[PDB]
């Protein structure tokens, strides 16, 4: 690999409005996996004082083309601006070291994963369930007045901090059963196939962590879908959230609630409880 094997330094352009000192960032131990490349825990200085924070840096077996993603992951975080309920970058080490792109920490994991661990034989209340909702949706118009479309909104997909705040990942860059008929068919993408994808993840919170289409092999999704297949109501789901479920799962993606809406929506049914 050319520029990595062939570069004794790294000369990527100084950018004053992100750049932070390396010798104010201490890196700690390593986050999740590594299907997303390297990411570790560290504390980070006068972002005074510590604070938290996560830590994307190269495989020490990257290719360039793990190069140009976390370059150009990087550039897609600075042009989206910063937003409560996404994971905001928050500085980024180019100069003189190895690159390294600081973004938010979120101490209790992905969205799944922090529904399941916590699922009755309460905790997981009908309001603790909205307002998982209600987060998401906001980050999710935030980042549509953006102009960024997602294409992968998934409970996995949405981490949560160690005050239970929503922050949706991988907004900057198997999921075909979060996929809206027209990305599954014909490939296009629009905020109306997020909103298909949001009716999903409203499904996965309220079933606490539960897989789409259960028993259902991914091949067959296609006409099944076609027949005009949808998921039935949760349980733990009064029908009114079953109603706005199923409402991001039309057919046709005008009829589907916008991401405004389903913020006005999901902040009513706050209110009441
Ligand atoms: C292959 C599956 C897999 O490994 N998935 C996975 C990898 C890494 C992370 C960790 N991340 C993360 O990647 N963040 C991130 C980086 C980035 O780079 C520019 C951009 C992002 O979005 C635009 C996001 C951010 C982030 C913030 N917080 C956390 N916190 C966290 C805490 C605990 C855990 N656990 C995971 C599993 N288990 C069993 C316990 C705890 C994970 C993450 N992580 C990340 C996430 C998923």
Redesign the pocket.
Known sequence: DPLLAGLVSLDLPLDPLWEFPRDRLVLGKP??????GQ?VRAEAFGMDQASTV?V?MLKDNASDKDLADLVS??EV?KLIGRHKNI?NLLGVCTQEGPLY?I????????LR?FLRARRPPGPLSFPVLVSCAYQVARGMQYLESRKCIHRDLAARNV?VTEDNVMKI????LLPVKWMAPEALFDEVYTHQSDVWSFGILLWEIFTLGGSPYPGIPVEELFSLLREGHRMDRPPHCPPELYGLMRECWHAAPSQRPTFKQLVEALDKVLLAV
Do not use: H, S, Y
């Open positions: 986050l999740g996996e590594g299907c997303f990411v996560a994307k992951e990087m975080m994971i792109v973004v938010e920490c979120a101490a209790k994991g992905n994963e981490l990942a991988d907004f900057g």
